[PDB]
Amino acid sequence: GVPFFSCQRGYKGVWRGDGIMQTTCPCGAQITGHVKNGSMRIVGPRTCSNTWHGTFPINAYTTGPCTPSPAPNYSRALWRVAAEEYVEVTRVGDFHYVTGMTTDNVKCPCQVPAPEFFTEVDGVRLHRYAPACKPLLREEVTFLVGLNQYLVGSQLPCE
């Protein structure tokens, strides 16, 4: 529980649903977000990086009726495809590639979902519950889409 250095990188952007969000940063700071017209006003202590940056750290201690609605313009995302398994997705233009996986031969859907179904987008967590991400395997591993296997680095087949 250390100020600034313990701090989770928080979300800043459009939210869906209006009302009050609350969370606790890993430093110990309680952060309040007031969401009105999709836009969040942050209230926090000056002991937390999130207060300075206008951001809201989403995690297992987040409460409130709203959810992030991120822009579809991300570079990388973490996508939870099984109970404790993740795939990393890299976007280039309108195309999406699996550039990493937590375990060899993860089964994933052939199409990326909308950005708010991602557990993380560019290092920012979007989901309240998320299991720990094991080390991402980025070489000589394969993912499954139905009955077809593809080497890491491969575009998702439904494009």
Ligand X SMILES: CC(C)CC(CC(C)C)O[C@@H]1O[C@H](CO)[C@@H](O[C@H]2O[C@@H](CO)[C@@H](O)[C@H](O)[C@@H]2O)[C@H](O)[C@H]1O
Residues that bind ligand X (CB under 6 A): 12-15, 38-40, 42, 54
Please identify, using beta-carbon distances, which residue of 14 and 130 lies nearer to ligand X: 14
Q: How far is the CB of 63 from its own copies (least distance, A)?
A: 5
Contact assessment for residue 75 and residue 116, using Cβ atoms and an 8 Å cutoff: no
Q: Does the annotation list 7 as a binding residue?
A: yes
Please identify, using beta-carbon distances, which residue of 43 and 60 lies nearer to ligand X: 43
Contact assessment for residue 151 and residue 109, using Cβ atoms and an 8 Å cutoff: no
Q: What is the DSSP string of 50-78?
A: HHHHT-B--STT-BSS-EE---S--SEEE
113 to 142: interface string for its own copies, x by CB under 8 A: -x-x----------xxx-x-----------
Q: How far is the CB of 35 from ligand X (least distance, A)?
A: 7
Q: Does the annotation list 27 as a binding residue?
A: yes
CA diameter of the chain: 52
Is residue 26 at the binding interface for its own copies, with CB under 8 A as the rule?
no
Contact assessment for residue 131 and residue 138, using Cβ atoms and an 8 Å cutoff: no
- Environment class of residue 57 by beta-carbon count within 10 Å: exposed (0-12), middle (13-18) or buried (19+)? buried
Q: Does the annotation list 48 as a binding residue?
A: yes
Looking at residue 18, the DSSP 8-state letter turns out to be: -
Q: Return the one option of ligand X, Zn ion, its own copies, none that residue 40 interacts with (CB less than 5 to 8 A, by type).
A: ligand X
Calpha distance 125→115 (Å, rounded)? 11
89: which 2 tokens?
């997705």
Binding-site residue numbers are 7, 25, 27, 48
Q: Which residues are annotated as a binding site for Zn(2+)?
A: 7, 25, 27, 48
Could you list the residues that contact its own copies (CB under 8 A)? 16-17, 60-67, 69, 82-84, 109, 111, 114, 116, 127-129, 131, 146, 158
